[PDB]
Design a protein around this nucleic acid. Structure first.
Ligand code: MG
Ligand code: MG
Ligand code: MG
Ligand code: MG
Ligand code: MG
Ligand code: MG
Ligand code: MG
Lengths: 70, 117, 151, 150, 67
RNA sequence: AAGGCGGCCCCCUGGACGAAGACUGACGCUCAGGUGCGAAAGCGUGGGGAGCAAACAGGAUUAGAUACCCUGGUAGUCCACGCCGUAAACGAUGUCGACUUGGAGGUUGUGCCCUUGAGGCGUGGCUUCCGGAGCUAACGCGUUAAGUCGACCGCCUGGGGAGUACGGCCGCAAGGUUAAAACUCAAAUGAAUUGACGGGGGCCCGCACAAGCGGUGGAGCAUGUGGUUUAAUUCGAUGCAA
């Protein structure tokens, strides 16, 4: 991403904008999974393990609204 | 030598080392510095402080050219991705553009196997 | 204490002139329950410093403390046996306390005819940023600001 | 360099506390075999009688029978030359519950053979587990710290 | 949000449209996921094909950097 | 159908689902023997080979490491034509038909109402999570049942021996398939519970750390301890907790 800083802009805010752009692009987070070979078996296992937790959280959110006042 | 008004600083960072190099506008290196040569050995050169030391050494190594308008290009998931840039800024060099071009294979060559540590 | 979080205790108003700063200076300068002679020494030194600097005693003490006032504490929050310290900003109360502790410690460090004379001589240097307090502040600040990549 | 048959198994099998650089006393045909001649230092321990802490377990192969008068005994108890000042540790801290001192290695010191001795004790297969666990755990802690701090 | 294609009754999506299609690509040339766009699974699979057609025909860059 | 399939385009083509219809008229289900497909690995011929990577070499750890950590690295992984029918080929749940409370979704089509906004009511196919009766040894299934029945095939009869040998067939081979007997034992197992353990995790607490402030290891001396000497150096206390 091009983060060419214009005039009258502090280096601090310029670097923060660059870091935010990198974070929203998610380039740094992709190397931690592209650094090694994940077998298709392992990838599918991770995907289902993440899907199971992803609606289990919503299931618990919608189920904890019945009892347990505080 | 012949002084250049504009420059591009490439910061190739990695998990174990960080290299910073300078070119004018086309990819012709002028000065380079590494954390290994910055007085650090082993994993001790992987700290962002070592990256800052390497960046300031590279800035000192390019004093004879006097670059005023610099554009920084980061590459690699290293701790120095911000330390090198801030060191370059603090060394008196003005930054004009900031970019992070990192090689992202589109499901290309197969990476090595998982390490069972 | 993990759960019991207490506040800050109150000290005597230092009825010599009346100042919490002076009371804290006295109760940190005193040792072995010798508050009487500690007060005599510190008051003699401050009265000499008043004429030596031309200003009031309290104002001259406050500005001398401010001129050697530090800003960063270098604590040891390392995760284990590995050496990993951390500098942090200091709250104003602990800042003043540490500054006056450094002053009274330099008083013991530099020797002379009497502790009153040592205190007077060291305050006459902290007035124009000399002695030991400012040197210690600089020596702590250089190593507290040279390590910025470590958070 | 000048190293000869050593017993590194006993280092893992025991807790070496202190070491002695005392020498060994051996007869003919054996010191020559130390150069070449297949000396083996397995099952080595001291056999204190009164002040005579002989090394009992050692098999040095005799390479010749050209002197066919003296009977060859590869399992001979070899005498040991140690200062009486430092021999107090051996008549002292040996017979408490299981303390032993074993021959860790044997080397050369200016054409004279020196056998390194060491005071140690057994592990009962539970100290070995703890040692291996700690050796692995320090490595794992260093690795995880390095990975976390990138 | 809501599927604007269904809201406006857009039956088909053509790669030739760029002004109203740039809204579905990030600044890095990546496709905005459905969980952020608010688009149905019927039209996400057609938006992806249109974006791929535009990338092939140099109408929308694959990424910010190419050379 | 299963195995399994992921930029885009072009050509051929199989299969699946829906409103409203028209049409033959039991043409329907299963199926030993047989036929075909069928992960990867493997084999033969002809190609290619960027990266990865059995075997192999070197380096490192360890008492030892013919391994896990690292640098290289051939077969192979990439293509065409041939051989095997092997997987935890799993949903450990065979194929087809009917019935049995409900809730919250995903995907796909259609009908209607004023569609001003994915406004509202219906209606079929696939699929996901809870959950009632019921079932089960219990975990658990629960309209896609492991609930009640109907039609058929295959398989099971203690754990080892053993899916082994022989025998027949298949295959260039590796091996696959069909499949025992002698001998040993009184056990071999699965679901769940209580403790215990983990180099599993989370939370909490105590001058436990941090923060401070004083001390002990440096030096006279004091009793006390172990060892030594001695006639005895009188008994016990021997990590915190002597
Ligand atoms: Mg293959
Ligand atoms: Mg390898
Ligand atoms: Mg090796
Ligand atoms: Mg099966
Ligand atoms: Mg059939
Ligand atoms: Mg259920
Ligand atoms: Mg067989």
């Amino acid at each position: 991403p091009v983060i060419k800083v214009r005039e009258n802009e502090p280096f601090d805010v310029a670097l923060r904008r660059f870091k935010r752009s990198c974070e929203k692009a998610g380039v740094l987070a992709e190397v931690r999974r592209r650094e090694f070979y994940e077998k298709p078996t392992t990838e599918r296992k991770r995907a289902k393990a993440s899907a199971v937790k992803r609606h289990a959280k919503k299931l618990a959110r919608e189920n904890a609204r019945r009892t347990r006042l505080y | 030598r012949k002084q250049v008004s504009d420059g591009v600083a490439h910061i190739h960072a990695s998990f174990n080392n960080t290299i910073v190099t300078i070119t004018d506008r086309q990819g012709n290196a002028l000065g380079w510095a590494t954390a290994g040569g910055s007085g650090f050995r082993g994993s001790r050169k992987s700290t962002p402080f070592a990256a800052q030391v390497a960046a300031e050494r590279c800035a000192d190594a390019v004093k004879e050219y006097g670059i005023k308008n610099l554009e920084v290009m980061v590459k690699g998931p290293g701790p120095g991705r911000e330390s090198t840039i801030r060191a370059l800024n603090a060394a008196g060099f003005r930054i004009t553009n900031i970019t992070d071009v990192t090689p992202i294979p589109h499901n290309g060559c197969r990476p090595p196997k998982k390490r069972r540590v | 204490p993990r759960r019991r979080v207490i506040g800050q205790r109150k000290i005597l108003p230092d009825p010599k002139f009346g100042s919490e700063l002076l009371a804290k200076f006295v109760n940190i300068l005193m040792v072995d329950g010798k508050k009487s002679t500690a007060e005599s020494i510190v008051y003699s030194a401050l009265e000499t410093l008043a004429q030596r600097s031309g200003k009031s005693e309290l104002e001259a003490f406050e500005v001398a403390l401010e001129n050697v006032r530090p800003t960063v504490e270098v604590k040891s929050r390392r995760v284990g046996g590995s050496t990993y310290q951390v500098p942090v900003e200091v709250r104003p109360v602990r800042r003043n306390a540490l500054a006056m502790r450094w002053i009274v410690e330099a008083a013991r460090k530099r020797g002379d005819k009497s502790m009153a004379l040592r205190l007077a001589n060291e305050l006459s240097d902290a007035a124009e940023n000399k002695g030991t307090a400012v040197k210690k502040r600089e020596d702590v600040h250089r190593m507290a600001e040279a390590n910025k990549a470590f958070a | 360099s000048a190293t000869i048959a050593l017993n590194k198994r006993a280092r893992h099998e025991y807790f070496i506390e202190e070491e002695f650089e005392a020498g060994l006393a051996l007869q003919g045909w054996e010191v020559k075999s130390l150069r070449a001649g297949k000396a083996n230092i397995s099952d080595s321990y001291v056999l204190l009688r009164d002040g005579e802490a002989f090394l009992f377990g050692a098999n040095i192969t005799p390479m010749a029978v050209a002197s066919t008068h003296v009977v060859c005994d590869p399992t001979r108890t070899r005498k040991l030359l140690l200062n009486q000042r430092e021999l107090d540790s051996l008549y002292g801290r040996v017979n408490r519950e299981g303390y032993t001192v074993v021959a860790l290695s044997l080397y050369w010191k200016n054409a004279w053979c020196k056998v390194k001795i060491g005071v140690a004790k057994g592990k009962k297969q539970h100290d070995k587990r703890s040692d291996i666990k700690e050796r692995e755990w320090q490595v794992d802690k260093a690795r995880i710290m390095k990975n976390a701090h990138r | 949000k809501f599927c604007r294609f269904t809201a406006e009754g857009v039956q088909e999506i053509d790669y030739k449209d760029i002004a109203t299609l740039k809204n579905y690509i990030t600044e890095s040339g990546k496709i905005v996921p459905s969980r952020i766009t608010g688009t149905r699974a019927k039209y996400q699979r057609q938006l992806a094909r249109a974006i791929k057609r535009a990338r092939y025909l140099s109408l929308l860059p694959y990424t910010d950097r190419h050379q």
